[PDB]
Design a binder for this molecule. Structure first.
Ligand code: ATP
Ligand code: ATP
Ligand code: ATP
Ligand code: ATP
Ligand code: MG
Ligand code: MG
Ligand code: MG
Ligand code: MG
Ligand code: MG
Ligand code: NH4
Lengths: 408, 408, 409, 408
């Protein structure tokens, strides 16, 4: 059976959204000489997303998507909170018509103001789901079945597509069995009754071991349940929370599963993305990931809450937007599901924050410097939130690995 | 959010299937010395599937699919219970390997025997979800948006696909709302939260009106639940029962909905396919369906319980197999969701028995006559068993239609 | 281990061809521009072929190809010996510059003359390896595997190609082994070391029985060896005599082979094509063939010795040209190797004359009638000559087939 | 007028093949001493092939190809005699069921034994007729018409395909004709009655001079005739000995022919590949070639007698296997027919051992190192055995070119 709400998304959820922005458009103090009293400057992700949600009506016009974060000036990433507006071709102010040129400052409910930054930006197509790696290193070999262990970054293959093993997780409800976590597009086939996963390839392709089958997956969680707020005025707003849980099979040796992210080391617990924390603790932070296509790479969290409006009137959100450092691409086709791990803040081990999303528009390009060409951007989703909606707890040590084995 | 059996539901259901056959296996009880003790001749559908499921190993050995029905000797259909074994190309025994030659009589549990027929038979692919080929008539004209009412046969369209409305159904339990029934592949999309239906076209493709959204759908149901017995030795056995229920929108005029099959007339309640009934009460019966692609097309039921072992070790079952009578096709691409109705024979109401299926093993060909080329066949889903899973009831009179809409 | 003749064999043959055609010109004493005696009109295929070979200079210049036969006038065959000239698009005289145009009569060596008929012509692409056979009748079903026996018309398949069993034959010399004849393109693959035949499909494509492997075949024969005469001025002229002989394996049930042409009946021995015989005894004759692809069709022998000069100065000849009757096609793709058989006209048994060639770039369209579209033509290899160069003998009665098995060494 | 062996001769050869291995199986008496002795280890390439031909049943199980040579541990060639088994993907031993896993040692008849090395392998498919993506150097320009002479490496071309001249060879008997040697696919073609050669292009493609026409070619030689022993259990074994001899035209200016392999220098006579000599005489020896597409390239002989069984059932053998140096490619598409030469070790003249084979699977890919991508390999036929079967003799000095041209 499949189910969708009957009267939930009509005149119970839309009127709650129509109530949220109803008040807003009465109690407004224009205050637009361009002085902007600095005590109402955005401080966290929640402030930036609330201003964008209010002014989303004038943001959709002549723009193919928006996001929140810091303003990018001359390629470099500043530490000024701004709303990133993505345009197809960024031209000089003189060649724009007045009704197209975006403002530099936007003020929202309660005088909360922020900057507006235009960024040349484009989307990629869907991956073809059996990609080429093109990274030749001793790590990719280990990741693609040449290693004697299965861990974060190892290639996981369904009957038609393969990706990467994000993390080793265990359930919370009842039997709380132990498995691994990846995104929905790697381990789920709607037109197929079961979803058997293999390492490194399924039997019809080559040699491999049977890892198990998907027990639960999510595709679409609304914005009010994902973030907890109304991220946009569109009543059909969804957050692409693609993730699939595959518990290790009964006739499968779990002792061949390591918890160390090969190429990174021992990692810490999941770091929740708190929408009220200062933006600099997530925006601009140096992250890394270990998948198979691209081995071990490192990048930068450029923006959050990437909003895209598809052909019809449905708003789709994606949580994380990472851009690789040193002009290197952060990921490649086939790194879907990889663990997004923020580099270790001084002492404590690195903590993961997301998994690489693998949907149609999971990758793309955007130009930062005029001296170089466009650079690839990689999209991710909130790990702390996905683990909440999948009832999964991450495993971080090999000793905790043996404890859940005798816990089912 | 989607769920799957944890594993244990499979582990403690696989044994029951093996335990079912192993029991009759140990005491083989041949009871067949070459000549078959008569009377043991299969009598109904259940008898035939029990012989095929017991001999599933040796039948799928050199076969692309099997189905139960009557033997087809020299093109015409007989009244002899047989297991139709589909081969890629039927040739003379003199050029056949002694091991690849299928037998004529197969023993069964307790001595229930039957014949074995060989049919040259092939498959097609997918209808690519927007078919352009169609018939031309005033009926099809009305069904594709020219009619002044919505009913069985009108064109339903998701955001990407074309289809045909099967029947105006009302839910049994719960809200007891009234909507329509069609194929799952017509109504449901994996990578989309909403499943909106329209007539005759979506707002992005052309003009139309909003009918509603899918409230429930079924994709795969196990054989022992769908039929009532283990129909094979493969522990991964499923039935392609793809149906979707779309309740009419709250702001929709039910007055423009009719419970009459345009081109067929007034119909009765659904004829439940009884596995204990004599074979000729469904096999050989002349049926008819009205969709959009082909319109009103009369056919004849040829086989039941079409088995299909894919290249990945999974068994699939499609219930009804229809071949267009008098050297014509029974349906075209886009008729997915039409009502398979039994033609009135002595004055009773034409009772519907199935709905046109959609997918990959959908519309292939088979050779019956020598003087003609291959003839198209069509897959179908058991309407009686589909309604007993979605918990729906078909409406037959416009006066009963208003009683259902007032009980919501 | 293949071999090719030496440059001496070429220059010896080369000058030999130059000498023959040269002495024709050296005494010509060209004639008056008036009447020609009826007694000197072309009478045989050899007359038409000699006149065409003499004027090969002015014929290949503005033509796709040429052939010998009767003049097609207003879409019908006449009794006028003529040299068919094939053009891509036949237009009125007013739109051709006189150098492009063609004369009505050609006068060959020795006062022998004939007509010149212009025909609109076109070639097709390559045969489809695995073609479509949309005939759908009981004869085709039996020819493709549903028959208890195997004979002329049965589908013979290599590991990647479908074909048609031409005739049950036996070798004249050697060990007198019994086999079957077919087209070379159907049964011969050169990038592979053996040519195994199967009826109806090879193991990698479906059920079937292993008939045997190709024991010998011929691709090209020179015109002076095939026709016996010099048919063209080009010293690089060859006849596409594509045939393959496949003797049944050491352990194959020959009792399942019949020498009956299903749909035609009992046939007689091969009707040899005599180049010095009258033209009407092969040109215009009604013929038939039983081919897997198209079943049993009937046609008309429209021309003979079809010439075609490719882009590298090589001249190629195909023997028979057949067009189906009643605006119908005579063959489809996959009928390659089917036995072209003269229909009985006065009680005699139907005797074959050729096999359908079916390869590289055979088959195409032919503009006969203006109110209709272009009709399909089909090429063929002279059966009488193909057996002479393959040293084969056609078996025509199942009684001769029984004894021919015992006469093997 | 082609001719093939009478099926009487085929059955006789198959019986002798079963009698050869039937003798090796009747005696046997393995009595393996556990780890086995060290003087019973193979030394010659004749002993390596007989171990593979004996164990060809178990080797074919899950191997696309096999080849004798040295064991490649960790990415490079060791001095251990081993039979290289080729797989599609080298996965760890833990992800392989014991039926598919390969043993490390194999003992054959007489107590001889050698190792087994697994190599990741793939075939490049059929190359191009008129190939592109070739090098640019003054050496390449001379080989493609810009030089005033023609010799080894010069561009020879039929009317459809390109290639290179292997060696200036003359017939041992007959008219003692003088010509050149090249690959069979480069020169000959089925659907023509004449194979005329040109340099650098045929008249239809561009400028060039008529060199000659193919007088003889051998398509396939059986392994018992080529090697002198049965190299496989399958009764259909053939060696891809594809060579052709093209004697110069009677009018061609033979003074423009040079016996100097431009790039290598003055070469010596053919180095017959002794099968009963220690493996280090061929395996590991550095080789070189002068082409056109690729020019002067060096390489390393990696294996011998590369066995490839297709899905139809035929076994095919290729003599020489060479990969490129410095992780480069040994040749490009278009180098078919160029003479492979053993580089001088002791300052002696270079000895040609093989010629580049130009059939469908003439090139391919294989992985050696984990930190780098897969390298390209090239096929070749035994030159000494090719000249023996074609009844030809290589000319190594321009003085012998005049002594050979006068004897005609
Ligand atoms: N709708 C639009 N479409 C295209 N270009 C636009 C649009 N609105 C503004 N721009 C361009 O973008 C400029 C503002 O870009 P942005 O806000 O990113 O500037 P910045 O961060 O101060 O500097 P930098 O461009 O170096 O990052 C405008 O001056 C104009 O040239
Ligand atoms: N695996 C197979 N693949 C292909 N053909 C087969 C196979 N097994 C049997 N056959 C062929 O099919 C025949 C059986 O046909 P079938 O059981 O349908 O007979 P029928 O119904 O009496 O007659 P008909 O097929 O003429 O309607 C066998 O005699 C043989 O020629
Ligand atoms: N080189 C040429 N290319 C195209 N058309 C030509 C050429 N030479 C002649 N023709 C045309 O073909 C005509 C000759 O027709 P043809 O030889 O078929 O005679 P016919 O049999 O009496 O007539 P038809 O068959 O056309 O009724 C010329 O009158 C001229 O119009
Ligand atoms: N059928 C197979 N398919 C893929 N890999 C296999 C197969 N059988 C064995 N292997 C792999 O090959 C390994 C054996 O090593 P191999 O034969 O390559 O020797 P080696 O050259 O000394 O080793 P290395 O690969 O470290 O250089 C096994 O440990 C296993 O990982
Ligand atoms: Mg900027
Ligand atoms: Mg039958
Ligand atoms: Mg004419
Ligand atoms: Mg005409
Ligand atoms: Mg190795
Ligand atoms: N032998």
């Amino acid at each position: 059976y499949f189910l969708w709400p009957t009267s939930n998304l009509q005149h119970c959820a839309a009127e709650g959204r129509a109530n949220y922005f109803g008040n807003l458009q009465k109690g407004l103090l224009p205050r637009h000489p361009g002085r902007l009293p600095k005590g109402q400057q955005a401080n966290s992700l929640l402030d930036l997303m609330t201003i964008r949600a209010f002014h989303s009506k004038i943001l959709r016009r002549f723009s193919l998507g928006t996001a929140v974060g810091f303003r990018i000036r001359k390629g470099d990433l500043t530490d000024i909170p701004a709303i990133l507006v993505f345009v197809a071709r960024k031209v000089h102010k003189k060649w724009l018509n007045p009704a197209q040129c975006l403002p530099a400052i936007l003020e929202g409910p309660g005088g909360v103001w922020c900057d507006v930054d235009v960024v040349e930006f484009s989307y990629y197509g869907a991956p073809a789901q059996t990609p080429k790696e093109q990274m030749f290193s001793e790590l990719v070999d280990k990741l693609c079945g040449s290693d004697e262990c299965i861990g974060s970054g190892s290639q996981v293959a369904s009957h038609e597509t393969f990706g990467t093993l994000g993390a080793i997780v265990k359930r919370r409800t009842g039997n709380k069995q132990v498995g691994f976590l990846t995104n929905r597009h790697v381990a789920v086939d709607l037109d197929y009754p079961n979803q058997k996963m293999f390492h490194p390839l399924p039997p019809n392709l080559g040699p491999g071991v049977y890892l198990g089958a998907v027990e639960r997956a999510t595709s679409f969680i609304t914005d009010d349940v994902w973030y907890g707020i109304y991220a946009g005025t569109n009543p059909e707003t969804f957050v692409r929370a693609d993730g699939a849980f595959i518990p290790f099979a009964d006739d499968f040796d779990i002792s061949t599963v390591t918890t160390v992210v090969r190429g990174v080391g021992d990692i810490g617990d999941v770091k929740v993305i708190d929408l009220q924390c200062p933006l600099n603790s997530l925006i601009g932070r140096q992250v890394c990931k270990v998948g198979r296509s691209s081995g071990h790479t490192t990048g930068t969290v450029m923006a959050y809450a990437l909003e895209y409006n598809d052909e019809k009137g449905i708003c789709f959100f994606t949580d994380i937007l990472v851009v690789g450092e040193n002009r290197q691409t952060f990921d490649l086709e086939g790194d879907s599901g990889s663990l997004i791990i923020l580099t270790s803040q001084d002492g404590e081990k690195p903590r993961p924050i997301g998994i690489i999303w693998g949907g149609t528009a999971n990758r793309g390009r955007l130009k930062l410097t005029s001296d170089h060409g466009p650079e690839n951007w990689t999209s991710g989703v909130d790990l702390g939130r996905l683990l909440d909606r999948l009832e999964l707890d991450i495993i971080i040590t090999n000793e905790s690995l043996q404890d859940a084995v005798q816990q089912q």
